[PDB]
Amino acid sequence: TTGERPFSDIITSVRYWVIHSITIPALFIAGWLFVSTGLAYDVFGTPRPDSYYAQEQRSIPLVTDRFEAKQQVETFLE
Amino acid sequence: ERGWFDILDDWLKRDRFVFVGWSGILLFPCAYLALGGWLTGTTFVTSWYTHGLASSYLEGCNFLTVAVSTPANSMGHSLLLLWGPEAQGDFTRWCQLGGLWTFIALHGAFGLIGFMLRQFEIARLVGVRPYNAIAFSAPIAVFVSVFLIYPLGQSSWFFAPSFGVAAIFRFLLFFQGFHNWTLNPFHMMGVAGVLGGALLCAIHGATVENTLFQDGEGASTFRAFNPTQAEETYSMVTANRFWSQIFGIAFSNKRWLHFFMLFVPVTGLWMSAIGVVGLALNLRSYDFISQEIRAAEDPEFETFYTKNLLLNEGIRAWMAPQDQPHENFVFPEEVLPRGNAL
Amino acid sequence: ANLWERFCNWVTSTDNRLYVGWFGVIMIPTLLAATICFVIAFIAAPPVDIDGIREPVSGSLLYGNNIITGAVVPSSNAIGLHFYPIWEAASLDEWLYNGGPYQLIIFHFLLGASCYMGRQWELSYRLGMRPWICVAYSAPLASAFAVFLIYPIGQGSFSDGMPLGISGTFNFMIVFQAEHNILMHPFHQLGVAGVFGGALFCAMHGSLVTSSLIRETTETESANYGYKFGQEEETYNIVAAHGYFGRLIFQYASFNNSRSLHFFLAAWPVVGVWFAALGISTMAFNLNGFNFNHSVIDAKGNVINTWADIINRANLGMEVMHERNAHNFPLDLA
Amino acid sequence: GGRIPLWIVATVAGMGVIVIVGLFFYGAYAGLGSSL
Amino acid sequence: ATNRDQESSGFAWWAGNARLINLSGKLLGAHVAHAGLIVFWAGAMTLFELAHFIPEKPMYEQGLILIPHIATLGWGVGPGGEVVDTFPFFVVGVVHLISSAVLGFGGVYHAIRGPETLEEYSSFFGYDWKDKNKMTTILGFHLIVLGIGALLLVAKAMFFGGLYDTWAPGGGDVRVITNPTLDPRVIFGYLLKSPFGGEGWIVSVNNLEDVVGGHIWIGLICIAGGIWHILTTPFGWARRAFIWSGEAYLSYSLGALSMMGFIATCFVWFNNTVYPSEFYGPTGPEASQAQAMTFLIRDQKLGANVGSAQGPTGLGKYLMRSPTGEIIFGGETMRFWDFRGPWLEPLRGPNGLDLNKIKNDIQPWQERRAAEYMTHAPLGSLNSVGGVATEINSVNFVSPRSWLATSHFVLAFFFLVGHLWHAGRARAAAAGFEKGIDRESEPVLSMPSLD
Amino acid sequence: METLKITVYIVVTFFVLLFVFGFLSGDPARNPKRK
Amino acid sequence: KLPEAYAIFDPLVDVLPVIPVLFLALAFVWQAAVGFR
Amino acid sequence: MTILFQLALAALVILSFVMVIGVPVAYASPQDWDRSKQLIFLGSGLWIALVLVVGVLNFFVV
Amino acid sequence: VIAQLTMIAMIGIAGPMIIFLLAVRRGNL
Ligand code: CLA
Ligand code: CLA
Ligand code: CLA
Ligand code: CLA
Ligand code: CLA
Ligand SMILES: CC1=C(/C=C/C(C)=C/C=C/C(C)=C/C=C/C=C(C)/C=C/C=C(C)/C=C/C2=C(C)CCCC2(C)C)C(C)(C)CCC1
Ligand SMILES: CC1=C(/C=C/C(C)=C/C=C/C(C)=C/C=C/C=C(C)/C=C/C=C(C)/C=C/C2=C(C)CCCC2(C)C)C(C)(C)CCC1
Ligand SMILES: CC1=C(/C=C/C(C)=C/C=C/C(C)=C/C=C/C=C(C)/C=C/C=C(C)/C=C/C2=C(C)CCCC2(C)C)C(C)(C)CCC1
Ligand SMILES: CCCCCCCCCCCCO[C@@H]1O[C@H](CO)[C@@H](O[C@H]2O[C@H](CO)[C@@H](O)[C@H](O)[C@H]2O)[C@H](O)[C@H]1O
Ligand SMILES: CCCCCCCS[C@@H]1O[C@H](CO)[C@@H](O)[C@H](O)[C@H]1O
Ligand SMILES: [Cl-]
Ligand SMILES: [Cl-]
Ligand SMILES: [Fe+2]
Ligand SMILES: [Mg+2]
């Protein structure tokens, strides 16, 4: 009894569904594409399945230098 | 209704679906960012560069194995600010260096401050005593001791817990093998307050539900109660007689009963927090010296205490090379402690 | 009335300081026997060959233990699930070496605690109470059955029952983690939610009721004197408490119905602990925690470790070290 | 007021939850995370 | 909408089925519809298992629980448990699936369309829970039905092709039982056996003649008892001992199913006669013994003298004594020396495992079976990674024995809880205090103080 | 050991008999309300 | 495998065993329809 | 026989799905209950016939 | 894959379809 429209009124109204039958699927498709385009890997710097190791390297690219860690990751990525 | 301060105060304190308050200005952004940083990291962010682990749905982990992991040991106790000297404003690199860890831990810390200020604020407006805020000091002591003090006493944030289901399981096992934390009387007091609290929760709920007054015709008894009713909904007298006769003692004072329900778990969590402050310094209850002196001189003397240290020794040697990659441990097969066959 | 009728009247009397009852007729002597044997063994029992390999473990205070390390040690792996009462032994000295006290204690205790649960039903019926306090107690009781009886049955030996001691308990937990990955089992996770949530809601309820106690005392008196045993009127304002807590979260997240609130308080920890108990009782038959060891693999086939693999390494340390002289063959299959 | 009955909104919404969680379980057995 | 809200029935929606206690027609609907659910699952599950089934792999590598039940009855299988014909499996699945439509039909009809109460309509089909005579009559009918079910098993075993016999001389095979055990000293002797190790109460049944014989007795006992209950009314001592109400009777049956659930759990875990290891995988005891046998065979092939080989502890590395002197496998499997199985028995003599036989007579088929059983031990993760908890992913295996034991322990436990719930409720309701304490008639207020 | 066994068997039988006969002795009636 | 004549019904057979779970969930759809009265 | 068999099985399947929805709807419906009882009886006898048809045709296709 | 998904889709809809039909027709729910 704080004023706002009751949730049960909103989610059973035709107009809620007209707005949301477009916004909900649009958001979901945008999330889908953020991954399917590969963009998620690049924003966050997460390795793709082919990018954890070089072909013959077999030690992990562990960061070992506090202030030049950013440079280490850049060289590791080289 | 005066100056802007008092107009702002009015609006902050409106009776709405989600109360805001002055505390809301700290709470909401901090809780939102802690939770969102957790969902963002577990969904998208690796721990390859800090731990050599995959840790996100993106890389293939499930709800049990995802985490936002701590930064590399080389980061020490860096605040690891986005604009700080490590990431220098590069968001991608900051994610790869474990910046989301300190982001979550610190927003989470300020958020808990805001939640507790919210408990005080709402209590003051509604005119109740602020015991809920007081009780919440136990969650606070636990968060601060385990997520801040513990790693501050150790070499780096690397050894804080990582924010994940399996990551936290790993943290428990590490504390067993390295700190023998089960032997610690402050942890034992925590366990008593948690299990004793769950005990009080169960027994008090069951007793009320089983000493109810027949206040309606329904065989489903929940409707036969009214919040504004003057009368107790259940019989303290009958409840007292039952437990006096079953167990030997019983509550007779409802006020004492409810205070004790605050006291037990709040006190147990505060005790566990003190033990963790000691573990920040490796100041463990690891050993009983008299046990070791006897066992060293008498190879036929064995107790469950000596059996558990053998397990700890296994945990340390088997887990350390992958759990502490900055150490570059190489332990040749021949040095690993193992019993026969296994 | 006849002797029997008076006896029955006394056994079932609502007037005894401690209720006796028919369950109590079995509970009293069984709990007494388990208690006396436990106390004497914990002080004075000699070392027990728990793993059947002639390597006796000292559990008692007089043989070099303290309160934290002491235990009544499980019976010998050579016995397995065989029933080993005192009269099965050639002497008390043999019975002691083989961990006879453990069996005597746990069988009398389980019988007695089961009767403790029946007695709770029994008295509630004598008092005209609703009957389900005994159902709340079934949760801790089921958990004691899991660790002292069901687990040994599954694994084929009481030597794998939980020891009656503080450090023995931790030994049981650590070995159980090596052998079942319990932490990764959703029934143990539900038990954690049950006990952490039980503690949380215990503190919550204590604090909400305490916060809304009606002013009945002065500042120099404990507020507890504001309540008198057996008074009719409720001693706090639930509407005030709900008004606080509905605002802390949002209105519909808070109970204003005391009956619903108290039912939730009962149910949450009781259901969680039933799942804890069923976790142990089903890992008894080796249906174990989730195994994601090497679940994440890169494009070439390199294993990319996750936190699950680091758990695995800790589990391996427990596994290879436990009962270090008892395995001759490469698999630990119970 | 509402034109769409609450029991339908619930049923459709619940079914949607089952589908998306179902998909997440399928994914535990195929592609990344599948051990294969 | 007769009795279909809380106001009129006294029961909230989440206790809605309690609204049925005195509506025998709709309650019969609920019961028949539910029997259709059971029969449905049995038929659909069998077809699913059959559709997935690769006949040359062991059943126990395939997550099968129903085909193993059919195979044990001697359908579809030949020597060694080799599958010779999947058609009997198909027939079982289809007949249950079809039958469930019939039951589902009756269930829906009674629940939704037929008379809500049966008493007006029929005095034979109507009932009052408090009518002790009608209760024992209906109970008698069901007893006769159950007795006929038991004799159907005897009929299969004796007249319709036999049962799978893991113990058949020369190797497991389907065998017709011609000499079932009738001696009450053997049949009822099982019931008085200790449930502890080396005894195992009824779980110890180790031959099909005792199994068949027991069902001859049980079929007759049930039929006789069923007749008895149709023709009698409870004695006075029965009348004074029990609560007589629908909820009370539900509670007694909940207790009994809980007990049976625990018994089944132990049966599938230990018994390898009516749960042949050919179909269900090795028992835990069996796989552990098979490991010791494996390495004894290996190491003796390498030249070890396994009789005299002292292990690290001083006990024999391969062979030792049980606490009563029998020669048994050593290492941790000492606990499992009560185990008996067709691949091991040829090596056992009157003093336990025979060293002469071990040295000279172990056949390649015994080596194979012991390797198979060691490597199919019933250990595995919830996501079905076979092996110890530290095992890496590769082998998709959880034993049918683990699935069946764990499920039934869970069910048996919750059935005990439901027993306590309902037994305690039935007592309170019969005495009139199930809805709470009368504020003006609170029993404790009329009692003297404890002190 | 034989004497001990016999003694315990007697003790146990005695208490089990009390439990069974006791619950047989009109237990439903032993409540505060309807008998 | 199912006899070959029935193979076309394989995907249907894969889904049937789950139908009982659906009967439980149906009770909730129904109750939601009558407002859990 | 495979044509007859496979049509008979598809028919059984389809009639089943129709009955699964139609029987409960008919039973809890106010109006048109007379036209319903007939269809239910017809559907049921047809359902049973198809089972026997599939059952017999089975052996000419297996 | 599409086959099994279609099957469960029409099996899954059958229950709520029954309730829907009954509700529209003011049946005896
Ligand atoms: C109440 C809300 C709140 C609080 C308490 C915090 C707190 C914090 N944040 Mg978070 N943040 C918030 C809201 C908040 N944030 C919001 C809404 C966003 C979205 C924009 C963020 C996004 C965010 C990011 C991306 C990061 C943080 C980080 C931090 C940490 C370092 C902050 C710092 O050093 O500021 C220093 C600034 C102040 C203390 C303000 C002082 C104001 C004084 C009193 C007046 C002086 C002003 C002066 C006149 C200006 C002259 C400057 C001139 C010389 C140029 C700290 C835990 C960092 C972190 O978590 O690293 C791990 C980090 O990287 N925050
Ligand atoms: C095995 C599960 C099961 C069974 C067999 C029953 C049986 C029954 N319940 Mg219970 N119920 C259950 C689970 C079950 N319930 C669960 C899990 C809950 C909690 C959600 C409830 C909550 C509940 C309440 C609150 C009530 C019942 C009532 C009833 C009865 C009347 C139903 C009615 O009025 O339908 C009306 C519904 C319809 C007309 C919709 C269609 C229903 C049919 C049966 C669907 C059949 C679908 C099926 C696929 C058709 C196959 C046909 C084919 C073979 C040809 C009926 C005997 C009522 C009662 O006791 O009345 C006296 C009552 O008030 N139930
Ligand atoms: C006795 C019951 C029982 C047992 C022992 C099994 C056993 C098995 N099933 Mg079958 N099955 C069952 C009933 C059972 N099922 C039912 C009711 C259905 C219909 C849904 C199925 C449908 C089915 C399919 C479609 C498949 C199996 C398969 C399997 C195998 C792997 C199972 C797995 O991976 O589990 C995974 C484990 C879970 C999903 C966890 C279940 C835990 C539940 C939710 C907890 C129960 C708690 C309690 C009952 C709730 C009470 C609440 C409380 C408050 C009172 C295994 C042999 C698979 C197979 O290999 O076939 C060849 C397979 O594909 N089953
Ligand atoms: C245990 C289950 C059971 C019980 C106690 C009843 C009882 C009743 N039924 Mg219901 N019904 C059932 C199951 C049951 N039915 C099933 C499975 C179906 C679908 C086929 C129906 C469909 C149904 C309809 C459509 C009607 C009834 C009616 C009746 C009433 C009269 C029956 C009669 O007059 O006898 C007559 C009996 C015979 C002529 C002999 C029966 C021969 C049987 C089939 C052979 C027995 C073999 C064996 C024991 C079966 C084992 C089954 C097992 C393996 C599952 C009575 C209340 C009527 C009623 O409600 O009137 C208003 C009514 O119209 N029933
Ligand atoms: C589902 C099966 C079933 C059910 C529910 C009933 C129910 C009933 N029976 Mg019937 N009965 C049955 C099958 C059944 N019977 C069969 C198959 C037969 C033929 C053998 C009989 C022959 C029979 C007779 C001769 C009598 C009954 C009587 C009764 C009534 C009271 C029973 C009682 O007090 O038991 C409780 C049991 C006791 C009080 C005995 C003492 C308790 C002991 C010590 C318990 C020990 C068990 C323990 C848990 C160990 C289990 C393992 C064990 C095998 C070693 C009640 C209506 C009585 C009656 O009123 O007739 C009209 C009666 O005189 N029945
Ligand atoms: C009452 C009620 C209820 C319940 C209900 C029920 C429980 C019912 C049942 C039902 C049933 C129980 C049904 C069944 C059905 C069945 C059917 C319908 C079948 C069919 C089959 C077929 C068609 C087959 C086919 C085939 C063949 C022949 C061969 C192979 C292949 C195939 C499989 C394809 C509820 C809960 C809802 C709630 C409300 C009330
Ligand atoms: C088939 C078979 C067989 C056989 C079997 C048999 C022969 C069985 C029998 C069985 C029986 C013969 C059983 C019985 C049981 C009983 C019971 C289970 C009882 C119970 C009781 C009760 C429950 C009671 C109660 C009470 C009391 C105690 C007190 C008072 C009150 C009252 C009444 C409540 C064999 C093994 C050979 C092999 C395999 C198969
Ligand atoms: C055998 C066979 C068959 C059969 C079928 C049947 C028998 C069916 C049934 C079906 C059914 C039986 C179905 C059902 C469905 C259901 C559903 C789909 C539901 C869901 C639910 C939900 C989703 C819920 C939700 C909610 C509510 C409502 C309220 C509260 C909240 C919540 C959210 C929980 C056919 C014909 C194919 C043919 C071939 C063979
Ligand atoms: C090892 C288990 C032994 C197996 C026992 C076999 C069970 C069959 C028992 C039948 C006989 C029981 O008979 C039962 O005995 C008790 C004790 O004398 C009787 O006597 C009792 O009556 C009233 C009933 O309100 C009591 O208040 C009173 O204290 C008591 O004398 C019961 O009224 C009678 O019904
Ligand atoms: C957010 C912290 C703000 C601290 C308050 C600063 C006082 S500001 C204060 O506000 C008055 C309103 O009565 C004005 O009339 C006055 O001019 C001004 O001094
Ligand atoms: Cl150990
Ligand atoms: Cl071994
Ligand atoms: Fe309370
Ligand atoms: Mg995947």
Instruction: Determine the N-to-C terminus distance of chain G.
Output: 47 Å
Shape of chain G: rod-shaped
Terminus-to-terminus distance of chain B: 77 Å
- In total, how many beta strands of chain B? 2
The major sheet of chain B is characterized as: 2 strands, antiparallel
Number of strands of chain G: 0
Largest beta-sheet details of chain G: none
Provide the helix percentage of chain G.
Answer: 55-70%
What is the radius of gyration of chain B computed over CA atoms, rounded to a whole number of angstroms?
Answer: 26 Å
Oligomer: part of a larger assembly
Give me the number of helical elements of chain G.
2
Number of helices of chain B: 12
Approximate strand percentage of chain G: under 5%
Pfam family, one (chain H): Ycf9
Membrane topology (chain H): Multi-pass membrane protein
Keywords (chain H): Membrane, Photosynthesis, Photosystem II, Reaction center, Thylakoid, Transmembrane, Transmembrane helix
Organism (chain H): Thermostichus vulcanus (Synechococcus vulcanus)
Chart the SSEs and their pairings.
The structure is cut from a larger assembly and holds nine protein chains of nine kinds.
Chain A: H1 7-10, H2 14-36, H3 39-44, H4 69-77
Chain E: H1 6-9, H2 24-52, H3 66-72, H4 87-113, H5 132-159, E1 163-165, E2 173-175, H6 184-187, H7 208-231, H8 236-241, H9 246-270, H10 277-280, H11 284-301, E3 319-321, E4 327-329, E5 348-349, E6 352-353, H12 355-360, H13 364-374, E7 380-381, H14 400-431
Antiparallel strand pairs in E: 1-2, 3-4, 5-6
Chain H: H1 2-27, H2 33-57
The complex binds chlorophyll A (5 copies), beta-carotene (3 copies), dodecyl-beta-D-maltoside, heptyl 1-thio-beta-D-glucopyranoside, chloride ion (CL) (2 copies), fe (ii) ion and 1 more.
One chloride ion (CL) binds at residues 171, 175, 322-323 of chain C.
Binding site for heme (chain A): 20
Keywords (chain A): Electron transport, Heme, Iron, Membrane, Metal-binding, Photosynthesis, Photosystem II, Thylakoid, Transmembrane, Transmembrane helix, Transport
Transmembrane segments (chain A): 18-32
Outline:
This is part of a larger assembly, with nine protein chains of nine kinds. Chain F has one helix and no strands.
Describe the structure.
The PDB classes it as electron transport, photosynthesis. Keywords: psii, photosystem, water splitting, electron transport. Crystal structure analysis of Photosystem II complex. This is part of a larger assembly, with nine protein chains of nine kinds. Chain A has helices spanning 7-10, 14-36, 39-44, 69-77. By secondary structure, chain A is mainly α. Chain D is 64% helix and 0% strand. Chain D has one helix at 6-28. Chain D is rod-shaped. Chain D starts with 5 loop residues before the first helix and ends in an 8-residue tail after the last helix. In chain D, 11% of the residues are buried. Chain I is mainly alpha-helical. Helix content of chain I is 79%, strand content 0%. Chain I contains one helix and no strands. Chain I has one helix at 2-24. Chain D binds chain I through residues 5, 7-8, 11, 15, and chain I through 12, 16, 19-20, 23. Heptyl 1-thio-beta-D-glucopyranoside is lined by residues 2-3, 5 of chain B.
